[PDB]
Amino acid sequence: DDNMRREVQRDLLLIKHRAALDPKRHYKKQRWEVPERFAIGTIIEDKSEFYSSRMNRKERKSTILETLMGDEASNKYFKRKYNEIQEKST
Amino acid sequence: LERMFAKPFVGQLGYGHRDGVYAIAKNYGSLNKLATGSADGVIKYWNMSTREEFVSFKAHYGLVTGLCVTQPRFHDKKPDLKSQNFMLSCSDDKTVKLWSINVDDYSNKNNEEGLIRTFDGESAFQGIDSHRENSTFATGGAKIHLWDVNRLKPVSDLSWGADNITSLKFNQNETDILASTGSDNSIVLYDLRTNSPTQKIVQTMRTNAICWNPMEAFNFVTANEDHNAYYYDMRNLSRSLNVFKDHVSAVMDVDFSPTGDEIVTGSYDKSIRIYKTNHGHSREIYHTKRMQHVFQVKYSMDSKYIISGSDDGNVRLWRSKAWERSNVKTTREKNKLEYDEKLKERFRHMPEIKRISRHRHVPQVIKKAQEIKNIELSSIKRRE
Amino acid sequence: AKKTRKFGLVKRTLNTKKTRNIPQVSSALFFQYNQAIKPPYQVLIDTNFINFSIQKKVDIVRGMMDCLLAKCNPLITDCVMAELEKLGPKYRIALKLARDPRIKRLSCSHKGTYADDCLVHRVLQHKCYIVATNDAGLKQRIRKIPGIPLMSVGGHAYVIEKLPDVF
Amino acid sequence: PKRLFEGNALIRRLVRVGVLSEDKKKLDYVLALKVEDFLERRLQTQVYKLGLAKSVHHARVLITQR
Amino acid sequence: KDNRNSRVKKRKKYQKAQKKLKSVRAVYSGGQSGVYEGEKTGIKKGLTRSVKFKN
Amino acid sequence: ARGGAKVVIEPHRHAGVYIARGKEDLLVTKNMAPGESVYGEKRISVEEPVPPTKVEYRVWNPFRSKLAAGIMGGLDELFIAPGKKVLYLGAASGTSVSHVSDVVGPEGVVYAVEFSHRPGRELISMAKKRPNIIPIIEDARHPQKYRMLIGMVDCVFADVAQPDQARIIALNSHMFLKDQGGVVISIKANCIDSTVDAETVFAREVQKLREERIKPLEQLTLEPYERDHCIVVGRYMRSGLK
Amino acid sequence: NPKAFPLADAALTQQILDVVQQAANLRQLKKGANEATKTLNRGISEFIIMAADCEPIEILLHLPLLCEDKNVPYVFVPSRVALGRACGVSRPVIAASITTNDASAIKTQIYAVKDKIETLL
């Protein structure tokens, strides 16, 4: 429905365009029109992985775009590639 | 609606045999079990319910020339009538072998699978049948021998003359009467309680088969090589009660329905007819491109189906009427069905009804052979 | 839509303009190798193959062993057996030949008696059988199917085509 | 006796090579052998399998460097 | 130099053929190596990479 | 992948399975008894509209569940609905039978059938926490020995590694499976025949089903997850295989 | 011990310990209860050999659960000292795991002994 609408829309846009977020991943090709019903939710680790797949608390951010821009290697990659394509545009 | 719903062929029994089915013996007691015997030498005991086998005995070196199924009456013990059935195979290489079959009919038990007993012989055995209720089997070779199950030597000899015998059959009621077909084209009635031949009739052509009828005890039909099935009384053998005429090659086997009113005949031509006892013409003809030289035919035991063993190595079972479905039917539909049958019986002889009821498709070879036979008969008639 | 209107619209056209199912490739196949075909072989028999074998007097099991130098289990479907039975009285010898304790029959669930479609579908679904034939249409379809050995009858004994280890 | 003599000799030669196992001492399994078995009994494959070499090509090089 | 040494050419052609095979169909390699990271390349709903039996 | 990342649930093509989209996709089924993990898997938790209620989800591991592998590789018709009673032969543990319970939902049942005793005990505990599963510790070759407990199931799933797999399935499906009923066999050729190879084993077992009156609808070979496994989806026809 | 249900007879022990010794020489073998459990969880174990006179028996009786859960063959041999000598370490090992590798010289013996164990189960 029409609350949390901006941040949910940004995250859906991100998941739709996720093939460009990382130059090592290269998902399969699908179109992925936005579904009819969905429910954003968090992943609960087991107590058996406190070292491996436990994430953190000061990095747990309430939005996938927020934690993406909180990451830093993605940030330098993004500014690098964006400067490249901007110079190519001008 | 009947001509549109006529669907006679229902299935076949597994993969069948290799070299053509020449012996068939149904179980007179139970309903599912029959035995088939190929000319290769292998005999099988089919469960018709699941359309599969129970065992498969490679039995002989030569062809099997007769099969019978039974229960022996041993004096050493009473064998299990219920967990086992018994088969009696009559070979070409002078042997009669009696086999057990383990049968899952009843579950009130839990070895001895095959070849209870063997009877060595002097001449090539050619036909076999078993005197019922007394377990005493007669085998027709070059002279017929009455064997007991518990005696390895043949108990008695029955022989009119020194000519061979092709086939035998006991009668159903008054079970001491035997009848025999011998290859000096002769029908000989034998008797057991006097232990002797009884009466001989010499026909023109050889009678390939005989079958008593189960509801009159002194009528029997003979499948005769001049395209005919002769329905004889016993006591007055100087004539025949009826003739059944509609074949074009040698009739190979005959059988009576256990109701005692219909005769099914399989021929050397690749076709199988059903007659009624009263009419003397074919009620129906069954035929397929895949069946050839139907060498044995056995009407079933509940009088609903017709097993037919051809010589391509397949034992196909058919319906006795091409409409009576196996499902249990409600009272409304059953009344409507009997009503339509009775009404068609009443108006049977109108020309339109007769045309659409008799228009059955026959293969072109049988059609052409029938019309050629009719031309030949008419020419003989005008000369006479 | 008149003819002159059609011509005008064609001229304006020229001037203006100037679930699914993808079957997986079998895990038996290095690019065309079909590495799931190791002896003893399993060979699907066809009607024309049986008849030409009768014509050229080669035995099925032993002539096939002479071809492949390995033990071969020939398999006959119900469609092929029905085609033999419908061919009937002139090919009685071929029927008694195909009815044999070593010819392991394998059933089918088809509405019809098209042996070509039965065999093509079998080979599409499994790719462990080698096909035995002499028919040109079935030959062309199976040659378009990748990685399936074809075994025709010809000359004095059988010939095998798409097997790597013919010798 | 021709079959017995030559077949037993062929079987024991293959068993000594190692291509035919112990429990397959029959002419049918001799019919069912293959090129992968023989190339597995070669020496460079045995050196790579026993682990004196990191790869098959490394095994080849070791053998021919004596 | 691949034309020079013949077995180097077969070696390199074989490893290239291995990469291309893995591109053609999904091959088996190892198993799961750590914890279940998830299907790293994505799940597709409407593909059905299964062999349908026809009649 | 981590224990904090937010993901977007979505309905799969199969009714009762979900996809968790994110940087990498996961397969997910709704948990029935929330708060716990039956074999230590990472569980997604959403919230739904009184204060809202937390609905927990679970993640199928395709390297464990041979049914996950079949969903993830892509099967046309998985015979397990959100309301059907399924039979599960060889339910070694919760690691797949709990997920089949979660996908048949709180209405339908699932008759877990196992033979040995130690996973029998752990299956007893897991099926005491779940309502839908009823556990049977009778041998899977003796349908007449556990015939008092199962009535007219809708589709059977088969993960027995025994070499008499087709016979076991024929017995259980003849006595318990409804007509026109789904069968899902998971064939493992290394346990059927170590001598002859995978495609021969698969074609042989498919023909055994075709003999035992199961029309095989389709077949998949779940490769990148498990070496040398097939799953055959078939339909018990019971009358007129044609 | 009925809890050690599949216990090998004499000839079966001889075959099993010979295969263990060859697998240790090739180093296709993982030794110890924790290392065997880790191989089983990894799913890379061919099969499992356990001791029977381990003091006590439960500390390795935890293994059959995972063993048939992932459907791995397992067997008990009488002497942990014999198992240690066959593994080729100076200490008595109570549980060893032959791992899976098909670029291995002893694949045929491994498959034979695994088949015989599976038949014993």
Added chain:
Amino acid sequence: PIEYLLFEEPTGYAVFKVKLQQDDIGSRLKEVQEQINDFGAFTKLIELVSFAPFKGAAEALENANDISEGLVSESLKAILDLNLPKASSKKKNITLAISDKNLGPSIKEEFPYVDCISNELAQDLIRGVRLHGEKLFKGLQSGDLERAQLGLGHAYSRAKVKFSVQ
């Protein structure tokens, strides 16, 4: 000749009397399997005659364990004693259709005048009865069958594993 047939149930035993037989030569046919599948065509074949329920859950558990091991129970012996007609112990035995070849001989030993049958036909009849279930009970009271299944399954499994409060 399939005169009576037994059926075990989590809430007790049911003994049915067969009225009309499907013919055993066309038992593999489309029409006979479809009239097994349809309910209104089944009651022309099978009507209920007796239905004795178990007393309590512990008696149900013990009787299920005895059926599993293949023996006869006290309640089962009582039901068959009340229901089956005593014919002559040498010829013309009374035909009871059951589902277990292992259960066959114990029934035969306890009643020499009865004859067990577990055919493809008897399995087909028992299959139809199991399919139609509570619709065949004509309003006779039973528990919720599925709740009975769950309870008895858990009890039987806990018995075979020996679960423990420790």
